[PDB]
Amino acid sequence: ATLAFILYKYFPFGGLQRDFMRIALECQRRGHDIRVYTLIWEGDVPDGFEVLVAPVRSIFNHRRNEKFTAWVRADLDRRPVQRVIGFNKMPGLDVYYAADACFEEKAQTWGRYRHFAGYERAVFDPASKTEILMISEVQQPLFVKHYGTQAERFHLLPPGISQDRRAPANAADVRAEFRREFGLEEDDLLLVQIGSGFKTKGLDRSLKALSALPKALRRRTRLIAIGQDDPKPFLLQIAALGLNDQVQILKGRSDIPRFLLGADLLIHPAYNENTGTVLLEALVSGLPVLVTDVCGYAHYIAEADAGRVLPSPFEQDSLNRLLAEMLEDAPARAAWSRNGLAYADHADLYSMPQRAADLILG
Amino acid sequence: ATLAFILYKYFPFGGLQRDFMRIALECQRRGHDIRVYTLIWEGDVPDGFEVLVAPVRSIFNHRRNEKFTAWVRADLDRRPVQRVIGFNKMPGLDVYYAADACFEEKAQTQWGRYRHFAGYERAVFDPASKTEILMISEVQQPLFVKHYGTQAERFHLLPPGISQDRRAPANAADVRAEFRREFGLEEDDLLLVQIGSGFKTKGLDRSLKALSALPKALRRRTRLIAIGQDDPKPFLLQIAALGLNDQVQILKGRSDIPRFLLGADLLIHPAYNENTGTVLLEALVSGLPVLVTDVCGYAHYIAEADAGRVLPSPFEQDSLNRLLAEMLEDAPARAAWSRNGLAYADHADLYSMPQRAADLILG
């Protein structure tokens, strides 16, 4: 009957959050009752969802998290459910959805440390019964290295791109309306950098590449970054590069598909990225992609011939050259667009929720 | 009841893939249930096919393949079948369809990748192995025997399995006329086609060089169309360097290959290596003259049919340049090569592979 889903924060403009929502909605469509435990819920609550916001707090995140697990534990003791699915690492999970990378590995590069390490071990320890849903093949060996987790407990899932990201029948109309709204002409080249966490996702690298463009391309090129981050540190870089009139940083928003159809390139030179849903959202929108090979979903871009993947180790000069080459070549971008849409029509990019629900429900 | 077919990748525009599909459909028509294990399946699943896509990935291709094997065996242990047919070399096959050349030979022409692929090849071809081998390239059989000592009686040479739609139709002249009209080819234009994904291996680099080297008269008349799923950029760079921007197109994969075969004037295929080369025979049965390197397993058909020219090893670009020029300049010879191909296609056994394969698979 009842499934309990646990995540620290729900809000619409995050990958973890969207993945949880799509899994919960799939489970509900199979006739299961949906209960959710969280510290905060922003936006609409779907019909039938029982969302419980925990009345606990602490100025220390780790202490807050401890109070949260105690609260959920107590509620579950009184109000039992059939299965418990967590999207953050903690004790008492039947299933864990591995949105995050391995903490212990990242640590090797103490109250807070012992909290996050312990909560990771609560999932991955060989004595834990938690089943792990993986979305990255890269991180599975790292969990095993640190914890010795049994192989049988890992289940690799494909992507779970939503259908509203696919280019619609009226894609030309949507693009035209967007470009009108933003005052873009046919010779303007709009780069989009999408996702909260601009530092990690390489906005600094993107700005440098834009600034380094040859004169003719530099005049034509604009960038919009979309994320919840404080823009203030980046405005300093923008001013020093002389890009005040060519860069905008927008807050999170729901109409990402418009931007994917209206833009000319998605740029994503992340320092690290477990997967990178926006990479595939661009692909299924027919938006060419420039991405670093460190991203877990970068391989799809190469495999689909839907953009360019920058090889490691990162060189800013190499990014600069590649951006210029992609922007200069309108035929190539037209081909990358066609190739993405073709790939999107046969590739297994959408089935994560069905695969996850099958494993969750048995 | 149930037959298990195993191939790492299914997609429409490949020889291995097309051969697999033809055999599977034939076996189904004889009343068998079809199960397929793969890492990726592009396209519709035929009615009645049980297609299992293994949820396994790795940073190393060869390690992924190892996980795939274990995944398949685990399923077979719980859901057994009558016979297991593989189109890639691996342990646990009752029957292997030799869609690949001898790996050990190429390796000689540790390293984790080498050990994996050598081990999987040995799993099939070792004298102690029970796997029955369906051969499509006779040229490769002595190399497997040299390297592994595989018993002669475990090899079964299949004929080609060219599909009916590649044979020149009654309205061939009209199809050609329409194609050339569409692409804007006049009677004095010469179209080369290079067909098949894997352009580097199949020698598109050599083809473009040969085109560029043509005498001025021929060069100006000659066009090339390449058709495959490859990233075109490395070839577009070469095309620009050779000054052939106005004379070459590189197209993505497509299903209407027959009209290109009928519309073209030569198929060029100077491959570095090629186990067989389906497109060579497709050209032949379309009456399209062929220029091919002798390394291709099906090159001997071109010579036997007298339906083109085979460039002998070792490869020298100058000799390809010369041969292309000689073939393009001689319109009577090309007319003869076309007639010879069509004639050969009317008597040779180029079509029956799937029925032969099913016979051997099902006993």
Ligand SMILES: O=c1ccn([C@@H]2O[C@H](COP(=O)(O)OP(=O)(O)O[C@H]3O[C@H](CO)[C@@H](O)[C@H](O)[C@H]3O)[C@@H](O)[C@H]2O)c(=O)[nH]1
């Ligand atoms: O204003 C915005 C910004 C983003 N999004 C959407 O949010 C998702 C972002 O996903 P992704 O590109 O994967 O970014 P992250 O959410 O930062 O994902 C990283 O971080 C997660 C952990 O929080 C991991 O699960 C992922 O594997 C890892 O790539 C996409 O659907 C975007 O369309 C919006 O709808 N609106």
Ligand SMILES: O=c1ccn([C@@H]2O[C@H](COP(=O)(O)OP(=O)(O)O)[C@@H](O)[C@H]2O)c(=O)[nH]1
């Ligand atoms: O765009 C394409 C490219 C190839 N093919 C077919 O794919 C097969 C390629 O087989 P071949 O043995 O020539 O090449 P391989 O797949 O072994 O590299 C032939 O039947 C081609 O007609 C096709 O239908 N469309």
